[PDB]
Symmetry: T
Subunit: 152 residues, 12 copies
């Protein structure tokens, strides 16, 4: 506690369709964009000596290749795989292959939606899972990650 | 009926392997190419004041990103997702995210093929589904779409 | 129509389709089964297709009409309605007379209860149309003409 | 805290959570349920949230506390522990009083036996946190404040 | 047997995450890289008048498009689809569309791993399947392919 | 003063056999005996009760179509058709008359194929196992629903 | 007539009847239903006793106490219908005939509500007919016990 | 011997036997099979009656009419084997013993044809042996009724 | 004049117990009685009928291998092995002799594990529930198939 | 000389009914009779045997919590709770006392919902079907495990 | 007492007990367990006979030979528990009561080991308690046969 | 072969494999089991592998041979044929003697009936070869040599 902390390098990965946040019927579904969420999250992290990086993609390969590039360079991942949660064994195997701990986040409550959304190829190997709490879910994952890495 | 119609903008999306149409054993499986089908369909649409656009891809992301780019620009989609019908939740979520009505088409009768082909991530949110009627399926979807948008 | 060989096509409609247009027409639609068949028969005749029709709430009347179609009808368009999910006997009647057919549904069965997702006909149909309303019968007619004339 | 309307929040903990910190603390952890609730109550008070708590191994005490919360509590945070997988009665108590809630688990249920993968609460919760240990209750508190104050 | 053989053109396809071979904890999981395996395999093939080509990708489309480009140019495929074995109907349909015989290989024993890894969209249409025998699996597939094409 | 209610009772296949075989074992009451009693009970509360029993699915479907805008409530025991007839479900939905499903026997005590009904989810409610009084209970429920008592 | 002793058992959450949004979900309380049913029974020389509880044990222990004291049970186990093998085995152990009643049509609700641990051993089941279901169960019990 | 009265019931589509591509699927018609079977029965003092129908009700109503009139039933329900609970309950209701017969081997066909609503309550089942299956069922019925 | 048919009857485990326990209850007929009668019936139609019953799966498999090019038709009651032995299925496929599956009891009236057979889909046909006459029916069917009568 | 063993027997719902109904049919032995006999058998081998039977799941959970660091071994018949109570599984795991699961009846001969136990995989072992002696067998096993005999 | 004749049957691979890594998996051999059990039985005037086999037929044929000769069977079918309908039908055919025993807790092992072809027709089942399970089965058999 | 320690390898073949090459050899193939084993034994000997073989239609002969292999055999290659899908006893024999093995099938089981898709051995095998015909045994031999010699 008394010493300066070591910088944590944390990567946030977002999957398909999350670039649409804030676009359709904003008076109904909300006005906050993904860029707004990540800007806020990057500032929150920087006040705790965390250098937060981000990629969102509709391209599964961009997410896989970014996980590979994270090897021995990133301390922790926060991932919202979106639709690829239910379909991508390749993302599971990238995360197991680089051995970086991660937390799974969803804006929506997947358990209140169709039954196909109730199965995740990541949840069993995640440190934990947050769903249904909106944009704050990313901040909760960041808080969890800092506490896990610094034992606080 | 008495007034000039408003132009309809319709996008046709084709998924993987449909670029192979007409290539293998044409005396056995048929000589018509996908370009032949789309040329004919584009002319059929133009005679009814429909501007028909098209993308075929083996790249799921190209299809997702084209759906995103369609937002507030396209009135209706006709999609043959091919193999991605059974696998792509991301395509389901792109179509729900942009809120454009669509019809699902297959050249083959999926119900006569393997059991994995009997489930579609699109069929329940499509306006309707055509399968097994070959290339004419696209024309039937176009006819349906014009009637739905112009109430005829 | 003149240069072509006449096609003989039978349309079969299952139970409850006689109710089309009856209840809350402002809500569920005004068009009757008679209206759909009149229009379809006119469309067929202009392409040298002689179109016959039977609708029934009696499974046997559909089976027996299929038997009577043997060596007399080129193509069948069938909306079996609720019998789609229940009638093995209709499947075996169609297999027994070996006439190609298309399955049509007005509604999108895939958007409805899971018991409607299974058909005893879809695997042996030439193809299936669902969810496009009454134009689905015209699409089936168009498809049948193209198949039998190679056009 | 001053400018805000006070929130009344109830935390409910199910069976066996009273054992936290008791067995092999060097191995499974030292922190007790009392330690988690003391900290959580202090965190709530600084944001003008009055936080009440009940833990029980008695399903009825949880049901009856939910009934007593009607028209008196704004939000519930619940870790039903083993009752997550078994108690339809707790589901119906929460539906019956119509208070929004968040489900929390210390452990990652998805990493454990398949019977723990099913919850009678998760579909009607506002959301679910699992696997993040005792900070999950604080995350649920943060979420509840943001939802009720639109912040 | 007495005549010179006709050259066989064989394509090896590798799916996602196989580029990680040899990288993590090599004293534990092994030091051999995918490039090491393919170099050895290409030399083994060249001594039997087989011209062996290779693509590994984390991009499903690169694998699909390479299969399409193989049409009437390649005699046989060896494929380790990795995670896409369990998920990609599109790869199944590319291989059926070009009608090139193939053998499925896995370094790991998929039957000893999670139940989702027990189903393959390729195994029923492969000539055969090798799993669990490590890098030699590719050599066994090559040996099998030569014998099938030359009737030896 | 009450407005007359018009109520139709529909009985499916094999219920015409009630009372016929080994009456000392399975009971002596016939379907005609149940319906005569029920028609009298209904008449005392200004309900005009009509009845069809059939082994012909079509006769039940066609009767339901003919009931449109003419009948206030249906009591149906579809017997074996409860587990097999989607067409009866769709007839009842298509005419939009409220109904109650009744079975003399406790279907939940019988083979597992009898545990599912194509009508139970869209019925007002379901009565099983209580013998012939179940039709009386259904009649009482229908009167209370239509007259808000 | 010989007096019949009949016990009505109600499971969890039925104490909430009539409390929330009464203009929407209904004004009748469980006490209203039981007071009416107790009167209906007393006019036919039936002594009707009642227990509603959110405590599974209270219902089990009441069933044990009914042994050789009660002629018939009417039970709405509410959520416990789908979960309590212990209630099934309490009813089988005391061998008192019973009818299962639900206010709501369980078949119209989620699939987990389609299965009952009691329905196969009940005399019969009534669902979806609201509070009159308890009256129909009482009528059925009288007819069975008095052969009328 | 005492005369036996035996009813043979045939379900849907069996009227098509012998009609389509006879060089491929066979020339024997249902009338050919039944005329032969009626003669085989008459030589053993069995009066054999027959109904084939595509109408489920005709088969149900024939079974009701058989009550206390017929000693044994042979039934090939064809497609109705897999679908008709009503036929099962008609046979259980009149309590006449019966054998189930199919011309084709249902076990070699699609999985929905593997389940019968009649097989568990039949005396026995014959499938796949063609038209001789009806003769074997007749032989079995004679042996059961005359204890031979 | 007919050509002689050579037919092998195979019986699986526990069928040697026929007739032994509580004969007044379960029957007095032994397997030897059934086979002696069947061998006589076959001989009258110029069929040479051979038999093996075993509790040893291998004795049945090895007999089927030995039948190759020597036996025209098999009648098999695999008893418990019907539900468990893929190896018997593959023996029969490997020698390509037509066969009929017979069971004395109605397997469809018994526990659900008895409802599946590794032989029924590749048999010419299946007879169950008709007691010892089922072997006679199978013999009649085999004669008719081989002689086109 | 042996060290005393402290052993707790837990009995779940409905076992208080043992011996009550139709004793000429279902048996006359009461739970009190079984426990008195078992307590005497344990005392002869320097085992102090305590007991709770309850229809209240919480009384069983709370007793298991109270056993922590005070009891060497548990014998539990959870009765109906065997098939329903994850909370009892988690109580037993949380105090880490070895246990044996016992049932008087053969659960495998009863309805399929009785075939699954939330305790059987984490028990030392399971005894079913052998009546009241099953508690004696569990006691013998516990003595042998704790004393390595 | 009247002498009881009791047969113990052991299935495949139980001959390996005590062979591999005895410091890890245990030193007791099957012959050690059976010699002790034979002595325990002989002190109670039980004649105990034993067969262990990797040959399914040897166990089936031994059960047939037990008919009217043996009062009770204790069986650990090992792998055959999950696979052998033939063993079930041998035990049902000779109608000798039996107890099923496993050394290991099958419920803690793979899901295919959770199902037994014998458990529903056994008198009872013992698993997970090691070699003492055979003694408990012997104690149970004595009590049943002598009403003690 | 000289510089290496000799490997002792056992090949086990299940039921019906004795029929290889017997029926319609022009159609299903001419090569016999004896031909495969002669060739395999020669291939082994050139790499200082002493190869023993048993084929049987008797499950017990396979079980007992596995028991007899304890502390005497380095590696097993097994084609259990139909017993792959049925024999828990063979699984437990191999687990009981703790000798590593490879499962081989001539045919592609995944292309055949669904009951052939499940193996009681595949999860505990070092690996599995199917569909490659008789060369699969040679591939298994090659794999075993590389594993035991670290080459």
């Amino acid at each position: 506690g008394s010493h300066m902390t070591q910088q944590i390098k944390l990567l946030v990965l977002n999957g398909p369709n999350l670039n649409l946040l804030g676009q359709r019927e904003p008076e109904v579904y909300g006005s906050k964009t993904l860029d707004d969420i990540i800007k806020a999250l990057t500032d929150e992290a920087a006040l705790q000596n965390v250098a937060l990086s981000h990629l969102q993609s509709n391209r599964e390969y961009e997410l896989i290749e970014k996980i590979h590039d994270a090897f021995e360079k990133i301390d922790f991942i926060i991932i919202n795989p979106a639709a690829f949660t239910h379909t991508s064994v390749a993302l599971r195997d990238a995360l197991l292959g680089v051995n970086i701990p991660f937390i799974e986040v969803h804006l929506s409550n997947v358990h209140a939606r169709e039954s196909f959304r109730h199965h995740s190829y990541l949840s069993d190997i995640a440190q934990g899972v947050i769903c249904g709490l909106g944009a704050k879910g990313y901040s909760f994952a960041l808080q969890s990650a800092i506490g896990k890495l610094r034992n606080i």
